[PDB]
Amino acid sequence: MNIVLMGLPGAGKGTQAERIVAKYGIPHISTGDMFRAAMKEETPLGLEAKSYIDKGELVPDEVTIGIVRERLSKSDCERGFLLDGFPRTVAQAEALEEILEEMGRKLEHVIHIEVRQEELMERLTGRRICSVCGTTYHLVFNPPKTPGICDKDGGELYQRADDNEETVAKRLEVNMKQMAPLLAFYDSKEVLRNVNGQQDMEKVFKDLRELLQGLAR
Ligand SMILES: Nc1ncnc2c1ncn2[C@@H]1O[C@H](COP(=O)(O)OP(=O)(O)OP(=O)(O)OP(=O)(O)OP(=O)(O)OC[C@H]2O[C@@H](n3cnc4c(N)ncnc43)[C@H](O)[C@@H]2O)[C@@H](O)[C@H]1O
Ligand SMILES: [Mg+2]
Numbered sequence: 001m002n003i004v005l006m007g008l009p010g011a012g013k014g015t016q017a018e019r020i021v022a023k024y025g026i027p028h029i030s031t032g033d034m035f036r037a038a039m040k041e042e043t044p045l046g047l048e049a050k051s052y053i054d055k056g057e058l059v060p061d062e063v064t065i066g067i068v069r070e071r072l073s074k075s076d077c078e079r080g081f082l083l084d085g086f087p088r089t090v091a092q093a094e095a096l097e098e099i100l101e102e103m104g105r106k107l108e109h110v111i112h113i114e115v116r117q118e119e120l121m122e123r124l125t126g127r128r129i130c131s132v133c134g135t136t137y138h139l140v141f142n143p144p145k146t147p148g149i150c151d152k153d154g155g156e157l158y159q160r161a162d163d164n165e166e167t168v169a170k171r172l173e174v175n176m177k178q179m180a181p182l183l184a185f186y187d188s189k190e191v192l193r194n195v196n197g198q199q200d201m202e203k204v205f206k207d208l209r210e211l212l213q214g215l216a217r
């Protein structure tokens with residue numbers, strides 16, 4: 001089970017990934033999550049990626065490909081994997097094709113979780129994160145019991161530098177542009193699947209699942 005989730009910022013890739021991983025036991029490889037972990041640890045990779053992420057820009061291809069090339073060389077990827085938010089450019093996709101060839105593996109599905117931009121903006125604007133456990137909240141759709149405080153451990157919530165409206169509009173524009181040729185790339189390869197992301201989280205998952213169980217032909 002060798003899978004990519006592709007989608008604009010907020011389309012639900014991580015929400016789906018948790019579900020996919022709980023069902024199927026393949027590793028979840030989020031380049032965004034990897035970068036954010038390095039940023040929290042303030043490692044050199046982290047501080048390099050920070051300058052891009054905080055602004056809503058893509059981290060450059062070379063470093064991003066390299067983290068993925070190293071990550072996919074681990075033994076937990078031998079029976080499948082779930083890439084989330086990689087590739088984000090055609091160059092990354094062409095590099096993945098070569099990685100996979102080297103590994104003697106093929107992408108089986110590239111799932112585009114499609115959600116219109118208006119909904120994306122609403123999903124993201126208002127997200128808040130617990131500084132201590134990383135639990136997410138939303139001001140509008142999932143607020144904490146006490147404003148600014150996490151229900152689970154009392155940790156202080158924050159707004160990511162990239163989740164304000166202006167930066168979310170930017171991330172949408174950057175990824176809309178990069179994703180157009182990338183969708184073309186994988187539609188040419190006949191591995192592109194489309195999922196309607198504008199459904200409840202369980203139903204998106206059922207539809208994804210049907211593509212993963214081979215039922216949607
Ligand atoms: N390959 C790469 N090359 C270069 N740079 C890279 C890179 N990969 C990462 N980067 C850098 O790192 C940065 C961050 O990248 P990344 O971490 O990949 O961020 P993203 O994909 O822009 O955005 P999210 O992770 O917020 O969205 P998601 O699709 O995972 O949705 P989620 O499940 O969280 O859900 C979001 C919200 O919606 C809600 N929700 C989910 N599903 C539903 C639904 N079905 N109905 C209603 N609400 C829903 C959720 O509860 C939640 O509140 C990039 O901007 C870039 O700088
Ligand atoms: Mg995500």
Ligand SMILES: [Zn+2]
Pocket residue numbers: 130131132133134135150151152153154155
């Ligand atoms: Zn917490």
